[PDB]
Amino acid sequence: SGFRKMAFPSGKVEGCMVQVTCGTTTLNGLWLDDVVYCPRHVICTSEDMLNPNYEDLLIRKSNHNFLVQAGNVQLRVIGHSMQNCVLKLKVDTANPKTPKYKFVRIQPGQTFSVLACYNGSPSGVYQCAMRPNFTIKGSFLNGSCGSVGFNIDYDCVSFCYMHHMELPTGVHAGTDLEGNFYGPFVDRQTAQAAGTDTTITVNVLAWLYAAVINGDRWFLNRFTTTLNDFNLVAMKYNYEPLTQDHVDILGPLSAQTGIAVLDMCASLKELLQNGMNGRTILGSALLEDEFTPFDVVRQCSGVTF
Amino acid sequence: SGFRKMAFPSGKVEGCMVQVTCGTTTLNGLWLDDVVYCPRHVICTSEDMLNPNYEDLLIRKSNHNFLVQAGNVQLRVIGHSMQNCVLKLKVDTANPKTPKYKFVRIQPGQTFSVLACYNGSPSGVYQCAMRPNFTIKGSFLNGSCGSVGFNIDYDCVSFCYMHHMELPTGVHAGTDLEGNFYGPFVDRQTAQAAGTDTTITVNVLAWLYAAVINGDRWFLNRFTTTLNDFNLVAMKYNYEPLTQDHVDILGPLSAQTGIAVLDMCASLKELLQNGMNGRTILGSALLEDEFTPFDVVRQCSGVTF
Ligand SMILES: *C(=C)Cn1c(C)c(-n2nnc3ccccc32)c(=O)n(-c2cncc3ccccc23)c1=O
Numbered sequence A, B: 001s002g003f004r005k006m007a008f009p010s011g012k013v014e015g016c017m018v019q020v021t022c023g024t025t026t027l028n029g030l031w032l033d034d035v036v037y038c039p040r041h042v043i044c045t046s047e048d049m050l051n052p053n054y055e056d057l058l059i060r061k062s063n064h065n066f067l068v069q070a071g072n073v074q075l076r077v078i079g080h081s082m083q084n085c086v087l088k089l090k091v092d093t094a095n096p097k098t099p100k101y102k103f104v105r106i107q108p109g110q111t112f113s114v115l116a117c118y119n120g121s122p123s124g125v126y127q128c129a130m131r132p133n134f135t136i137k138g139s140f141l142n143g144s145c146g147s148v149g150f151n152i153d154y155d156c157v158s159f160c161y162m163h164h165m166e167l168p169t170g171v172h173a174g175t176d177l178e179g180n181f182y183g184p185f186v187d188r189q190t191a192q193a194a195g196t197d198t199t200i201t202v203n204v205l206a207w208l209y210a211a212v213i214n215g216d217r218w219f220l221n222r223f224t225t226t227l228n229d230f231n232l233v234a235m236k237y238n239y240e241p242l243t244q245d246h247v248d249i250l251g252p253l254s255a256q257t258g259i260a261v262l263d264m265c266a267s268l269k270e271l272l273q274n275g276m277n278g279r280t281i282l283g284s285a286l287l288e289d290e291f292t293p294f295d296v297v298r299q300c301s302g303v304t305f
């Protein structure tokens, strides 16, 4: 049946992307009901990003200093406030294309789709995962702030990420839709350490279950392992410690393929110690960890919205 | 800045996906203006797919035998015809969400975004490429026929692919929006050979240019090569022969990075003969060939729609 990195249909999010201009800085905004959400660093100049006093910079700003554009239509700003690191511009008009939505703070290891935008216009969509160090490895250029990450549950759009900065190491950092950064990052142009990134172990196991479903079974060995001895090989190769909760989520994948979770950990343990010897799994020559067990079930069952 | 497999915003295509039912078979349809396009094998039973006489099977079908559903709204079928391998159901109502569109028959090696649909409801979106053997390696389950592949040029949606069958080897085959199959495939449940698949050489070179832009420069060597001697290493490793046209398209990538195309072919020649030695390029341990030179420029410049 095949297996691909798949993103949610971005139709419901395209109708909410607007362009926000404050002075010379222009970035993307998210228009839901009569409130426009955008990163608060839109009020900063190129020289202000070094050490910005956001409370002092926002004081010098009025309602008419914010230009919100939805296509060719201008939105009247009648209120502004700063919640953590996001700016909330109250507009006089509710977005007629507002879908059913919620604000959700996802956990490290979970995945979401990103709609990369520039000047309020969508450019592309791709699937990513929140690394354990609360960073993401996306595709972001200059002007891509304001771009949101989201999950879709049938009719509801769960917004979970807003892009803010590109770290000097090349990775990306951002906040939730309430302004709280993911990780120890601040909206300030300074050298910030992301920390040791590790591999989402439960996502790797789910990806191996998807390989068996699609006929890729060459890595299945003749061993088992304990939950304690497996996390030992995991901690050596910079892998997340596997917990009983992770085993519980892998239940449906273990029952569909008839392979016990502990047996799958043994095949993964052998792959960590012996490598792939040049072979591939689902068209990849490395261990992919950007598919949650829920993503594997969705793609191997055809869940629509 | 990062590099990711990126798909076009599927908002304009979501508004055209409908569900078509003929007897017991149900698949997806594409609703543009007052015409619904769907694969013609919707008129076949499970036992009819072995050796179907489509001209004889369609004769036993009337206008009222086709149930077209756009959400919860029924469409009145007032005309039907068979163009090659697609069925064109004329409806009494033009789609109010019809975007500017064209029908395009793409060439092998070019890429396009796929919106996987089930029962007329979109489920996901992903980028793929038309392999030189006119197959695609997508993610398709039962009921995913009717799913279309498309490219977006600012305001125009260029439809280029409609999914029809999954070959016994696991790959997928389909037609253009006029019904002409890509390759020597027929809409018949029989064993069909896809042929020797090869690697899109111009796409691999463009992917290496994207690596240098993003800072991945470890594969740059100290050699050059001729266009004749390079296609010799290419023909040995099942790679497409590089032509002067391919070199012309790689012009902007060669001028942006300051690396001649023939010099990039030498680094690629060394990678084919020596492998990667365990290293990675843009987070991949193999040579990716699903990025056209136009896809690299779009993602490394931020082209929006
Ligand atoms: C957003 C519209 C502009 N932009 C900014 C302002 C920044 N940026 N520079 N220093 C900063 C400190 C704190 C927060 C943001 C910030 C930025 O990094 N990027 C940005 C984001 N992602 C990728 C990227 C790639 C190349 C240049 C900039 C850039 C901004 O877009």
Ligand SMILES: *C(=C)Cn1c(C)c(-n2nnc3ccccc32)c(=O)n(-c2cncc3ccccc23)c1=O
Residues within 6 Å of the ligand: A001, B026, B027, B028, B041, B049, B140, B141, B142, B143, B144, B145, B164, B165, B166, B172, B186, B187, B188, B189, B190
């Ligand atoms: C489409 C809604 C149903 N479907 C069909 C009918 C077929 N299929 N079986 N034999 C065939 C011969 C010629 C054309 C189609 C055809 C089919 O293959 N698939 C299908 C397509 N992609 C992936 C896939 C995965 C698992 C089962 C079927 C399947 C159909 O969906």
